[PDB]
Structure formats: C-alpha cells, structure tokens
Design a protein around this nucleic acid. Sequence first.
DNA 1: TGAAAGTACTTGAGCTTAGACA
RNA 2: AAAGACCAGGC
DNA 3: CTCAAGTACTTACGCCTGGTCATT
Length: 135
Amino acid sequence: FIQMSVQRIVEDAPPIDLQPPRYLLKFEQIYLSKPTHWERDGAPSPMMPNEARLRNLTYSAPLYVDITKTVIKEGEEQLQTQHQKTFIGKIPIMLRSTYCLLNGLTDRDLCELNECPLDPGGYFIINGSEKVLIA
DNA sequence: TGAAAGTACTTGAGCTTAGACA
RNA sequence: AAAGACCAGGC
DNA sequence: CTCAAGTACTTACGCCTGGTCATT
C-alpha cells in the first residue's frame, strides 16, 4: 500500500484544471519518512511505538508529495513553479512494517526501546490504542 | 454477495341487442 | 455523565 | 364495481460482561 498503492493513487488523480488565466496542478511523486512527532513548538522527533501507546499518540508518518504549479497568463509564456516536500497529511504506520521505526532491529535493539521481541507487529497505534485491520 | 414472508394499499380492466303480450 | 454507535466475549 | 395483479410496508431476535469513540 505504501510503496505502490499510494503513488498510484496520487499519480492517477486528474490534474487540477481551473480558470482569463488557467492554472494546472500536477502531483509528481510522494515521499515517506519514519514516524515523527511534532510537538507544540514544532520540533520534529522520532516517535517510538511505546511512547505512542503511553502518551495516547497516533503512530503515523508524514506524507510529502512534489507538486508542480503551472500558470497560463495568455502571454505565450507559462510559468511553472514546482513545490518540493509538500505536506498533505500523516499516514498511520503499521508496526514492524518496512516504514516502521522497529523494522530490521534485533532482539537487543527492541529490548533497549522497551519493545517485546516476540511482538509480531502488524497492527496500528491510534491515540495509544492498538488497532488491527480484519481482512 | 447471497438473504423472507405475510399483509395493506392502488387500478384497471371488462360486456350483445334493438322492436309489437298484463 | 447522561445517550447512542460499534466491537469483542460468557451462558 | 370487482379482483387478481401488482406494488410498498413491516416485521424481529433471551439475559449478562467489558472495551473504545466521537459528540455533547
């Protein structure tokens, strides 16, 4: 879903055609980061799943998509402005998936962060609650 | 994605037939 | 803390 | 003035435990 489906959905959506000048908006490619928490002061910091459970936070990762804005002023010159890392929202991250912070960590690493090595993962943390999607 | 049975409403058909006996 | 929704479960 | 031929319309389902959740 993260690697293919999100990019397919973003690139599939028709571009914004509006209008007399005309403006066209196109989304190029989405970018995912590790789950990070933005505090009141706005300082980013990695959010670990245990801290998400304890503080009733939502274990999610910000989603950034490159957007190119093109303006048509009827002067035969269309000025195209591209926007990098445009933040459109935060996608909840299934624990121990590829984009989870616990991915690829050994038993000692998981214990150092107070996470059970035997924890199979595969669930989401929303407001501190462990949610599992039923097929 | 399957999937239920009885009942309260409407509506709209549908039809050989005329004289002069009490 | 009232009234709802959903979920899981017991017999 | 029917009546069979249709269409809407209505039903329900034992008790108990707990958890979460968004809104008020």
